[PDB]
Design a protein around this ligand. Sequence first.
Ligand SMILES: Nc1ncnc2c1ncn2[C@@H]1O[C@H](COP(=O)(O)OP(=O)(O)O)[C@@H](O)[C@H]1O
Lengths: 46, 115, 132, 175, 134, 102, 505, 178, 124, 67
Amino acid sequence: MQNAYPEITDQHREFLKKQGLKVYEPKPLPDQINPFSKTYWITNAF
Amino acid sequence: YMGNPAVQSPPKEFFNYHYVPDNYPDALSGFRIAYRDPFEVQHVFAYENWEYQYDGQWWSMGSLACNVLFFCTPLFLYLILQVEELNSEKRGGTSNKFYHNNAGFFHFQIYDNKQ
Amino acid sequence: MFLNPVKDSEFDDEVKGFVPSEGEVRFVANKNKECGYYLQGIEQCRRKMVQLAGDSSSQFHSLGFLPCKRLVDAHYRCMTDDKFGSTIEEVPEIGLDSAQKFFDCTFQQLKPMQSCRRFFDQVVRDVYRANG
Amino acid sequence: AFGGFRQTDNSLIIDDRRKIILNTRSLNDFQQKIYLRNFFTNYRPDLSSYDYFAFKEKLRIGELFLNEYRKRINNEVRRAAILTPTSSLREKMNHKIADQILDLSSPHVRGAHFQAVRSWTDASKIVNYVEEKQTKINKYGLQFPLLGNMTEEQCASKEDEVYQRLLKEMQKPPK
Amino acid sequence: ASQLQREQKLVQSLQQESLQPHLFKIIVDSQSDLVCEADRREYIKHYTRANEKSSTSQLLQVGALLGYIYAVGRYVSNPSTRKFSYGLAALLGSFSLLNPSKNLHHNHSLREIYSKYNISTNPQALEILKSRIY
Amino acid sequence: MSSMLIWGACFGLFTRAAACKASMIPLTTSPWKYPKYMIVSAVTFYYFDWYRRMALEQLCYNEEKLERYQIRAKLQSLKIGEELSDAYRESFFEHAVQKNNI
Amino acid sequence: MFNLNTIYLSRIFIEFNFYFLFFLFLISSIIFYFSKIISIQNLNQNSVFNFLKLANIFGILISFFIHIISFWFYCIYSYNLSLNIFSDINLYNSNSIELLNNSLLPNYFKSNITIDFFGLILLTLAYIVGFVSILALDTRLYWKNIKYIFSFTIFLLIVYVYVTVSNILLFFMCYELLLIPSFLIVYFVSPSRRAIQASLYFVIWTQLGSLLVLIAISYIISITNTYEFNDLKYFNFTNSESTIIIFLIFLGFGFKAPIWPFHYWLTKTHVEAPSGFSIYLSGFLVKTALYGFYKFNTSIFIDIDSSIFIAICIMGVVDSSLKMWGQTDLKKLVAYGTIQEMNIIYLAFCWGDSCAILGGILFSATHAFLSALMFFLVDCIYRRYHTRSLVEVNGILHITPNLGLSILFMLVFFSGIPGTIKFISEFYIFSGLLEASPFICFILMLVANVLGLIGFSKSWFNATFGMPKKNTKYLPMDLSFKESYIILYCFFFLFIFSYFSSIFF
Amino acid sequence: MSIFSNIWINNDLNSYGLSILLLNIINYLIVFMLILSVILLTNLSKFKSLNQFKEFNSYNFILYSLIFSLLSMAGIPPLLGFTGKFLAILYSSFKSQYLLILFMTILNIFGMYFYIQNLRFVVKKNKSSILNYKNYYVNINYSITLNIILLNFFNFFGILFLSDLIIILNYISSYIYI
Amino acid sequence: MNISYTGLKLEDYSDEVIRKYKFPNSNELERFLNREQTLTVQQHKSAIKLAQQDFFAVAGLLSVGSLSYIFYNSVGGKVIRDRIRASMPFPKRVLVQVLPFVALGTALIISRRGIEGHNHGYKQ
Amino acid sequence: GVWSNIHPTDKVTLSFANIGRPFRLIYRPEIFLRDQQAKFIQLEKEHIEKSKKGEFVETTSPLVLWN
Ligand SMILES: Nc1ncnc2c1ncn2[C@@H]1O[C@H](COP(=O)(O)OP(=O)(O)O)[C@@H](O)[C@H]1O
């Protein structure tokens, strides 16, 4: 699959980082939400 | 035709419930059978026994235009389907055709050989 | 099956699909409905000759599948409409490789006759494309 | 043995191949089979029963694959609706996504339609597209186990083949 | 390096005898000319019989537990829950310690089949098994 | 299963039982009828199996004889003028000339 | 990771489940015949009728569980079998897996078993609807007519042969064997005196349809002297022959569907048949007619326009939907609902083997369960209040709250709520018809989902609500556990079948 | 009947139609004996009008034998009378007679309602008394009962064994022209 | 009839024809003759035996569980059943509870092992 | 079983699905074919004999019968 969006330059990305902006990235599930976590299974046992 | 608002005496001769000989009765909830209302039973067994009196009565009874439209409804449906077939043919869409694109193989049918 | 290798490719086995002509499809279908007896005969002959002379101690083991050679030649003549020789050895050079593949897949790697039909029809299609 | 039904039409039949003239009303079962019942009833009559079963399965998978294309483009549009505000969504969508959406439209994909009306050439093209995808995923042995059933020895041999192929492709000059 | 280590592991597995039936099964699956066709057929039959996982083991374990419960609830008069629970635990532990109907009359036939070929020191065995490693 | 004698014996047993039920007489009535019915049914169905095999064999032979009759009827059913036509001249002369050696 | 074991698992389970049902039926029949002289019920506790009921109900239930397992085995086998042909792209090797027959039991009728998804869906409907119907017939089987406790086992065996044979003649025969047990049930088990004429009408209508199907199959057999669908694939019918065949099969299976104007028998029978058979008649047998039509038409190339058949089906839908307001009898109203649903399903099979049979199969299952639930509710009402007409019973919700709640939730499910499977079938069929004919799709949706629904809800809402003032001394009790659990199982299936694997839908 | 290089190929059996006619006649005779064996088992004077099918309403054997014989006469499958009509229609299709098939279907449906119409009359308000009295008790003839049992077996399950009868009749008819 | 080895000589054909019509090796010929080029008859027989045993185990367990569940939970009304179950020894109550569940559960477990492929050896 | 051990097809199918067909063809297909191929087999034998003489007959070339 292709990128589907108009490409931007690394100089533009550096400029945006200079202006205080942050690149959006997905965040991992917390231990409570993650169904493969000791916290999840301790909650289940409780 | 419509019901008569006038008060009428209860019917003396009306179709009633009849059971097969040697019928095992329904004994649910203590086997309590109440006497049936004559007017209610008459309405129960009225439509099933209603008949037309003379030839052609079915046309003019009620609304002649509505009866004609109801009678011609299958023809109207077929003609509308023909118009839609014209539209699909002009546009190469799904037609009213028996699409034999599987060459006879059935839907998820097992096709295995015996040794 | 109906794929041609891409001559200039970024990877080893990139292929591109193609569709045969309606004339080729009609010809192959008609001949297969007219010459399908020979193909079933080749299958049954292969099985019977393996039953008879398959054992190495048999007298006819050295003859191999030669009794089915007549069936193969008859199938070739029927599929080619008696215009490209009386034997499959007289096949045009375009269908030579496909004929070799058919013979291998029919008598050396005794595959089910579906693959053998694929290769024989490939021979017929090559001949048809050469001499449409 | 296949038979036939007696015909009632009084129409002459002329065969150039056999140089014979026949009447439709007077035909035996074999003559009806070779003259009246000689037409085709499937997209690829040149294929065997097994080959056309494979062709039909690949055609169904291809229709579902085009529907999968449309569903994926819809999911990416939904993703754009969330990750991109409306102030600039339509520009980025008209960049590349809108063209693909219109490419995967009512005639080009079956969608919810009862029958995808394809000619035999179109069905063959769809099946060839499916076969190209199958070839490019099987050269790397990706079919097992989602799209293929292979024994343990077959899996090991395929792994060795894919390893050799990967080494050869990695050690090729860039274009 | 890594491929050399994989080949060394293959040779080490060839040296061992526990993995030897498995390696010969891999050889047989390849349909190579190293193994005779009759040997292939017999080894396939014996290996299939030996590696069967029948449902009769679970059925017998189920029948023994239910049979014990029925017997102790049918004929014993005024049963003691302590002894009944101890017997349940003992039978479950015996099921745990009992091997799943392991057979010994099929593995020796496998060694009869594959002892005809010196798998440890066969140049063809390595060539066949170099490609096919699970 | 495989034995028509045993099939007939079972048929006779069940026929006797169903005749007892149908007559409303109790089972175990006229007990000698059970073995008698078993023997009669077994013999009858064994003979019918043999006779059907014989009839099938002789029917195959009669069909071999009948194929000649159908050919010679088709040649005799030709409409006037079709005997010497190109589609039937060879067969007509084979049967009229070659097959005339009495 | 699909191996040879699962293939034999599925095949063995199918064959040996048929033999399980047959052996249970045979043992039960032997016990029933050889333990009594007259074979009528001895009116005492120590009677074989208790054992007969137990054996038949348990055979149905356990064979249904085995059928669930075998259906899952078949689903896995069919998925992986279609995968194997699709998987391999090398031209040298083809999928050639030749199977051996089992040793313990023979092939019944010397026919190799062929299993399709529609056939096994039909078999599952047979099992469940027969279970519900036999549970609804215990109060009807008594002295001198207990012999019909085996009727649903006979139906299960007949349909088991019906949906598993590739022989066209055995297929037709198994389709033809469903008449005698049905007529015997209607003639001897029905309590209403008007049910004799209803049985006669059912027999004559369904047998005219069977005669048309017989003519079609006679054409098929005589023209191409064979009995196999593959041999049909190797033969082509001329345009006139194909037209005659399609007309005959459509008209016959529409006599059994039923279709306009051949639903008079269905109305009369449903009004007069016993509630158990009415559950079984509407739920299942019409689906056997649908399966027969699907098997016949898919295997034959037809070059005529199906607009006439589509018009007949849509006219049936409209005609059934417009008559729902004028029905004061709840059972007759449910019969008209059955007619509407059956015509809608039969519409989906007018496009050959396109992606329209999926909605037909799903709607067949949904209508089976919905008709079973509705006729069971009518049975509960008739057993409680001793009437079915709207003018005699109303206010059920206040005296029998569980029955009223069941009626209301039945209406909710019948209204095509998205959570259930009726909405899925409507979505399938209506999307296909809208792409085929938008105006006819709107007409069908308007008449069926508004006018018919309005009438259907009017006749049920008036029964549910009101005041049961008259006959307070004779007012019944609430729903029993059997009826409650049957209704809950119908609801549970209609809800959870939406989560079935989408591979086959 | 085809010809290839003066060699005739014959895929049709000329004697098959006569065998079908014989099978139809034999099936009708067998079903006619079945219905009239029940009549001869009873008081023959009890059956005068068509409404007096109620007289067959007796112990279940007579009742069910009557109703199944009537269904077989009407051609309801899989009873013995259905097989003859099915084979006749199959042969007519083989002979390519669509109009004859249509008229056979008309006659079959009309006669079928003619037969099953009497099934309504079998309903009786009580069990009937149609057996002759010998030695102060009803005379039930075991021999006729056994005959009816055999006829009922060959009427219910006769479709399973019809192939052997077809073979015998085709063998008999094969002598007509040879 | 004419498809036979009689009258055939290797000298009547060219070497290419002889080579391309030659028999394969003994192993290939035996595999083709026995129809065991992919799966052997012994593998098929083992699969059939396992399938039959699985069906019989599943059917027997389902029958036992169905009969035990009904014959133990259908002895009367709610109060009557409560009294009957209370007036039981502990092993009898355990049997009333354990037996119907164990048989059906084991049948379902056998079905689950049937539909699954954990035995595949290509694992790491 | 014993009733249906005479043909590998069920008795119902034998009774109804074989309309106007020779019982030789139904029960002994190989003998039926070899009997109808009597002249063709002789022509094929003559063709083989002439082929061994180096004389290829084009007319009887299609006649290559296996059964
Ligand atoms: N079944 C019916 N058919 C026609 N008109 C009716 C019917 N029931 C009620 N009506 C009309 O509704 C009115 C209500 O009358 P009702 O209250 O039943 O009688 P009363 O006023 O004597 O108590 C009547 O005057 C009558 O005109």
